[PDB]
Design a protein around this ligand. Structure first.
Ligand code: HEM
Ligand code: HEM
Ligand SMILES: N=C(Nc1cccc(OCCOc2cccc(NC(=N)c3cccs3)c2)c1)c1cccs1
Ligand SMILES: N=C(Nc1cccc(OCCOc2cccc(NC(=N)c3cccs3)c2)c1)c1cccs1
Ligand SMILES: C[C@H](O)[C@H](O)[C@H]1CNc2nc(N)[nH]c(=O)c2N1
Ligand SMILES: C[C@H](O)[C@H](O)[C@H]1CNc2nc(N)[nH]c(=O)c2N1
Ligand SMILES: [Cl-]
Ligand SMILES: [Cl-]
Lengths: 362, 362
């Protein structure tokens, strides 16, 4: 059955991919070649073209992604050649460098060897390649609570964080045949960070907030034509609200709203003062201003929704059904000020696509 | 089949209602009496108790309503006795007076005779009993665009608005046997309105914004035990965001954000300045401050979500499944600052409930 599922997904992917690439006449012989290779080997190897276009299609089919206008410009790095943890490490390092691009962020994915019999060749533990550690001991809370369980697991393995609120987690991943993962400290020269200041309010620097430049999701499975690339880290640039309205704002993350209200000089005592809303706006202004001042790519939620509207029009122009998850597309502040809020979206799953997978710790 | 659907809905409603009222032992004989009356008459009449508890249950089952904590305190006015348009008019007038309660708003529903063979006894045309007219002629836009088609229909019938941006629409409804509806101008002494000022920014009054005190939804069908009360206007009080983030903010409503930005002294030129977000916060602050200064009931979205959280806990305590529509429960500003955003809700339809019905104009 495994092989039948593979074949079915393969024929659907190859016909749609080759059609988009103006390569329709080659489907027949390519599908023949695939059917044999599946027969003979239990799987099949994607060509460079299939692999690149598949990763791009997967982004285009990502229902929760507002940044999909730029799906066709994805920079695909084919690292199916790696066999050593040193090669994996260097690949991850390179991905950080090339994607960061001195602040002018390049949407990028690095693709590692896929699962074989559902057996992972390479298993990445980080949620993002660059993220901050989190600690909770006897009432004492430091850093990013979303990172508490991975942090605890790294420290099991002999890593030790400095216990600032912004400790960079090491890269941590496991190789097929290894019982334990390895970890490598990130070279600080590879990691761009932005201090958060506000354009008008000087006291805002008293918060000593910062965030990293490039979010690189490293724990999702890329699925293309029945082949499961469980290790395939990818990045775009941030939408400001991800940092200003969630990472720094949520009570279960950095929980900064009360401190924000204090430095902007408003009381945080009455719901009817809308001090949370006001702190949200200033914090979010500060984040966009800071990334822009430093020369690090970022987009605001209004601009991003305007791009997504273009993505919708483009899909219609091309004859493709549009899919989307309304609950994730609406931004977490002023959602009704975007067109997204005022329409609905078909949440069907189309492949290729990126999927969640179980975490090896926890 | 109509009668079978009726009977089925009736037995489900009577058992659940009598159970909640500690009246379980009476279900059997009451259901007998109902089965006969359906047999003999084609329908059945609710008791005072059933009618009151049914309307309350319908509110409790309203998935899109964040204000449901207070479902059991609903004030139910039984107007199944009316036969004349003068009685209907006076009922609507009374509902406005008693619900307004000099600003200390009382959640209220007035229930008129139900449909018979799907034949309406009374057909209310207003979307709310109190709403502002809207006009669009040769590029010229006045008032509330959501009201353009009902306004045009009223003016068909010989009503004429003054063409301010805040013309009160007349009550308009039709009686069984009549070909045309009638309209009655609202006595201004019945309608409480609130001028919008801002607690800190004096210029905010230059916008000359106002809104009415009491939103009274007058076009939804109440369904209780298979009986269809198509005319059953109800009200609570406003959540501030309904006015400040939607009615006054949407581009297809009053579209005030650019004017708001100007009076609060910020530029409306750059998406990255988050001027829309900032204008939203100040406009929303102004609305809550204004209702509170006047002594007219209103709730902010944070307080309302905290109440709804209590509603959820109360449902669990009572053993009732909770249903909700996430897309409507999240407020339109700072949704992620409420607990609602961070959980999901079963959007199943449970009856009794309020439903949409086709508009007699358009
Ligand atoms: C170009 C810049 C991009 C922007 C501004 C952007 C924006 C976003 C945002 C704001 C989210 C919601 C994330 C959250 O709430 O945690 C998201 C989700 C997502 N984006 Fe994008 N994105 C971009 C590029 C990409 C790229 C390059 C890919 C893959 C090739 C991608 C795939 C996804 C996926 C799979 C999700 C959903 C993740 C999940 O379910 O947890 N995006 N995007
Ligand atoms: C006590 C004060 C109340 C508050 C603060 C409140 C709050 C709200 C809000 C903010 C909405 C969304 C409306 C929109 O976006 O247009 C809503 C929807 C709703 N509320 Fe309530 N509500 C209250 C009382 C009531 C009452 C008394 C009933 C009926 C007895 C009711 C039934 C509903 C229904 C049916 C909807 C959905 C309407 C639709 O689908 O268009 N609510 N409520
Ligand atoms: N701008 C960005 N933001 C962004 C884009 C995509 C995802 C993202 O983070 C979302 C994290 O979401 C969750 C939520 C719950 C659990 C998890 N973890 C898992 N992978 C799961 C395992 C099992 C169930 S969920 C991830 C942030 C980008 C990063 C990379 C490309 S664009
Ligand atoms: N605070 C309030 N706000 C509130 C509560 C409930 C509804 C509400 O207005 C929602 C209007 O929603 C729509 C949206 C689209 C169409 C319609 N009109 C119709 N009835 C339809 C006919 C056919 C399809 S929809 C109404 C506002 C209250 C008023 C009364 C009690 S609480
Ligand atoms: C398409 C989308 O469901 C629609 O615009 C909804 C979104 N959520 C909403 N939520 C509320 N409370 N009121 C509304 O009018 C809407 N509009
Ligand atoms: C329960 C709810 O679906 C959940 O909290 C979602 C809501 N929408 C979201 N939207 C985005 N972009 N990111 C998120 O993490 C979430 N969380
Ligand atoms: Cl993030
Ligand atoms: Cl309204």
């Amino acid at each position: 059955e495994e092989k039948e599922i593979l074949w079915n997904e393969a024929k659907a992917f190859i016909a749609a991919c080759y059609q988009e690439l103006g390569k329709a006449a080659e489907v027949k012989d390519r599908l023949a070649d695939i059917k044999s290779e599946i027969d003979l080997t239990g799987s099949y190897v994607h060509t460079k073209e299939e692999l690149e276009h598949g990763a791009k299609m997967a982004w285009r089919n990502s229902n929760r992604c507002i940044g999909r206008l730029f799906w066709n410009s994805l920079n695909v790095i084919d690292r199916r050649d790696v066999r050593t943890k040193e090669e994996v490490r260097d690949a991850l390092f390179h991905h950080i460098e090339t994607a960061t691009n001195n602040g002018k962020i390049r949407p990028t994915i690095t693709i590692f060897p896929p699962e074989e019999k559902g057996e992972k060749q390479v298993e990445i533990w980080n949620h993002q390649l660059i993220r901050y550690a989190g600690y909770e001991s006897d009432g004492e809370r430091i850093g990013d609570p979303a990172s508490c369980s991975l942090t605890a697991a790294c420290e099991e393995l002999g890593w030790r964080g400095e216990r600032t609120d912004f400790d960079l987690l090491p890269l941590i991943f496991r190789m097929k045949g290894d019982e334990q993962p390895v970890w490598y400290e990130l070279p600080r020269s590879l990691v761009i960070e932005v201090p958060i200041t506000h354009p008008d309010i000087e006291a805002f620097s008293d918060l000593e907030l910062k965030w990293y430049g490039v979010p690189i999701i490293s724990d999702m499975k890329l699925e293309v034509g029945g082949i499961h690339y469980n290790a395939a880290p990818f990045n775009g640039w941030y939408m400001g609200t991800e940092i200003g309205a969630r990472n720094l704002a949520d009570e279960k993350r950095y929980d900064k709203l009360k401190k924000v209200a204090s430095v902007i000089g408003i009381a945080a005592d009455y719901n009817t003062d809308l001090w949370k809303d006001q702190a949200l706006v200033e914090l979010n202004k500060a984040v966009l201003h800071s990334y822009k001042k430093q020369g690090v790519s970022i987009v605001d939620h209004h601009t991003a929704a305007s791009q997504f509207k273009r993505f919708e029009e483009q899909a219609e122009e091309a004859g493709r059904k549009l899919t989307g998850d309304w609950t994730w597309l609406i931004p977490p502040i002023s959602p009704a000020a975007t067109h997204i809020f005022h329409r609905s979206y078909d949440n069907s799953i189309v492949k290729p696509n990126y999927f969640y997978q179980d975490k090896p710790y926890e």
